[PDB]
Design an enzyme around this catalytic site. Structure first.
Site, PDB file in Angstrom:
ATOM      1  N   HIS A  67       0.855  -1.217   0.000  1.00 16.03           N
ATOM      2  CA  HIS A  67       0.000   0.000   0.000  1.00 16.03           C
ATOM      3  C   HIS A  67       0.875   1.245   0.000  1.00 16.03           C
ATOM      4  CE1 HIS A  67      -3.176  -2.794   1.089  1.00 16.03           C
ATOM      5  NE2 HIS A  67      -2.525  -3.116   2.196  1.00 16.03           N
ATOM      6  N   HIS A  84       5.818   6.977   6.544  1.00 13.60           N
ATOM      7  CA  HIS A  84       5.505   6.565   5.188  1.00 13.60           C
ATOM      8  C   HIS A  84       4.938   7.763   4.470  1.00 13.60           C
ATOM      9  CE1 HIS A  84       1.742   6.125   7.460  1.00 13.60           C
ATOM     10  NE2 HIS A  84       1.156   6.561   6.364  1.00 13.60           N
ATOM     11  N   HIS A 122       2.148   9.130   1.061  1.00 21.26           N
ATOM     12  CA  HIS A 122       1.040   8.906   0.123  1.00 21.26           C
ATOM     13  C   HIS A 122       1.360   9.838  -1.033  1.00 21.26           C
ATOM     14  CE1 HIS A 122      -1.458   6.967   3.286  1.00 21.26           C
ATOM     15  NE2 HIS A 122      -0.706   7.727   4.053  1.00 21.26           N
ATOM     16  N   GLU A 172      -3.277  13.552   1.153  1.00 21.87           N
ATOM     17  CA  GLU A 172      -4.525  13.098   1.786  1.00 21.87           C
ATOM     18  C   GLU A 172      -5.227  14.335   2.357  1.00 21.87           C
ATOM     19  OE1 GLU A 172      -3.443   9.536   4.171  1.00 21.87           O
ATOM     20  OE2 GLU A 172      -4.373   8.614   2.436  1.00 21.87           O
ATOM     21  N   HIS A 198       3.713  10.959   6.587  1.00 26.95           N
ATOM     22  CA  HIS A 198       3.099  10.686   7.888  1.00 26.95           C
ATOM     23  C   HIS A 198       4.127  10.089   8.814  1.00 26.95           C
ATOM     24  CE1 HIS A 198      -1.110  10.480   5.952  1.00 26.95           C
ATOM     25  NE2 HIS A 198      -0.704  11.748   6.189  1.00 26.95           N
ATOM     26  N   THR A 206      -5.723   6.703   8.118  1.00 30.00           N
ATOM     27  CA  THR A 206      -6.320   6.929   6.801  1.00 30.00           C
ATOM     28  C   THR A 206      -6.362   5.683   5.915  1.00 30.00           C
ATOM     29  OG1 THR A 206      -4.293   7.619   5.673  1.00 30.00           O
ATOM     30  CG2 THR A 206      -5.585   9.353   6.837  1.00 30.00           C
ATOM     31  N   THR A 207      -5.894   4.539   6.445  1.00 29.59           N
ATOM     32  CA  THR A 207      -6.035   3.258   5.727  1.00 29.59           C
ATOM     33  C   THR A 207      -6.715   2.303   6.695  1.00 29.59           C
ATOM     34  OG1 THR A 207      -3.905   2.326   6.517  1.00 29.59           O
ATOM     35  CG2 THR A 207      -3.898   3.474   4.428  1.00 29.59           C
TER      36      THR A 207
HETATM   37  O1  LIG Z   1      -3.060  -1.803  11.001  1.00 32.70           O
HETATM   38  C1  LIG Z   1      -1.990  -1.398  11.520  1.00 32.70           C
HETATM   39  O2  LIG Z   1      -1.214  -2.146  12.164  1.00 32.70           O
HETATM   40  C2  LIG Z   1      -1.515  -0.026  11.244  1.00 32.70           C
HETATM   41  C3  LIG Z   1      -2.133   0.811  10.431  1.00 32.70           C
HETATM   42  C4  LIG Z   1      -1.718   2.185  10.116  1.00 32.70           C
HETATM   43  C5  LIG Z   1      -0.590   2.817  10.631  1.00 32.70           C
HETATM   44  C6  LIG Z   1      -0.273   4.119  10.328  1.00 32.70           C
HETATM   45  C7  LIG Z   1      -1.151   4.840   9.479  1.00 32.70           C
HETATM   46  O3  LIG Z   1      -0.991   6.151   9.174  1.00 32.70           O
HETATM   47  C8  LIG Z   1      -2.280   4.252   8.980  1.00 32.70           C
HETATM   48  O4  LIG Z   1      -3.095   4.951   8.128  1.00 32.70           O
HETATM   49  C9  LIG Z   1      -2.556   2.915   9.286  1.00 32.70           C
HETATM   50 ZN   LIG Z   2      -0.476   7.640   6.032  1.00 33.57          ZN
END
Ligand SMILES: O=C(O)/C=C/c1ccc(O)c(O)c1
Ligand SMILES: [Zn+2]
EC number: 4.2.1.1
Length: 257
Positions: free
Chosen positions: A61, A91, A93, A103, A116, A195-196
């Site tokens: 992702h 990370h 985007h 975002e 981020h 955001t994910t």
């Molecule tokens: O599911 C997890 O373990 C982490 C998820 C995660 C971590 C950092 C972010 O900014 C984000 O959108 C999602």
């Molecule tokens: Zn992010």
């Protein structure tokens, strides 16, 4: 599973993650004229001098640069935060074109990418427990615009060839995240979410007003990454951003007049 394509993108996430339509989802558009200066906000404290990076991973992702968070090395405190938050990973985007990729948006303006820096509240012991709490995470968001190169980003750009596809990782020690920060720490802050997926509502967002500049060559390299795994049809990792979500019953506060 979820992703950023036409059939599994942001518009579909709510079927597996109903919180996608929650009360404090992220990102959001930052309307600069509506954000109110909050004189009580303490200046941000970013202490990254003892940061210990470990590895960089393409997770299908985005790519994450991971840090050792087993001790109070790299921490974020102050600003709207109570307590100490430890850096665990950062990370980005980004878009398929320079006109999109971020975002958060500012007065509906989209930047080419967004960084981020993710931190978790040490009162909760570990990241997994922290994401289950309303004040579990603090994410520092930094916008990227295309212009001059960012020297401090080049080491990340150069290792991308080694982690082209999903599941690949590479050693990434001795990387200093201070090289990714703009001059000013003026920011906007509001309560939001990851955001994910799982889109958990556990984030105090702190978005810096000043973007950093990266070169066209640097962002072009981001766009050569792949969402797929090795040996699978090539799908370029571009447009891995979620669009702005309804602000609902929230106020965005500014640290500056
Ligand atoms: O599911 C997890 O373990 C982490 C998820 C995660 C971590 C950092 C972010 O900014 C984000 O959108 C999602
Ligand atoms: Zn992010």
């Amino acid at each position: 599973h979820w992703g950023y394509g036409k059939h599994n993108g942001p518009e579909h996430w709510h079927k597996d993650f109903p919180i996608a339509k929650g009360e404090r989802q992220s990102p959001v558009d930052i309307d600069t004229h509506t954000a109110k200066y909050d004189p009580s906000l303490k200046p941000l404290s970013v202490s990254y001098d003892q940061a210990t990076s470990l590895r960089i991973l393409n997770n299908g992702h985005a790519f994450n640069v991971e840090f050792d968070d087993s001790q109070d090395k790299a921490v974020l405190k102050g600003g709207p935060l109570d307590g100490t938050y430890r850096l665990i990973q950062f990370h980005f985007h980004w878009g398929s074109l320079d006109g999109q990729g971020s975002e958060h948006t500012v007065d509906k303006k989209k930047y080419a990418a967004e960084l981020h820096l993710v931190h978790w509240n040490t009162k909760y012991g570990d990241f997994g427990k922290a994401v289950q709490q309303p004040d579990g995470l603090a994410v520092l968001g930094i916008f990227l615009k295309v212009g001059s190169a960012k020297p401090g980003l080049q080491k990340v750009v150069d290792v991308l060839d080694s982690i082209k596809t999903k599941g690949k990782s590479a050693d990434f020690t001795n990387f200093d995240p201070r090289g990714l920060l703009p001059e000013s720490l003026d920011y906007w802050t509001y309560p939001g979410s990851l955001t994910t997926p799982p889109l958990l509502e556990c984030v105090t967002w702190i978005v810096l007003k000043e973007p950093i500049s990266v070169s066209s060559e640097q962002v072009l390299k981001f766009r050569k990454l792949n969402f797929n795994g090795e040996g699978e049809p090539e799908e370029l990792m571009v447009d891995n951003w979620r669009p702005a979500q309804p602000l609902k019953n929230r106020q965005i506060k500014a640290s500056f007049k």
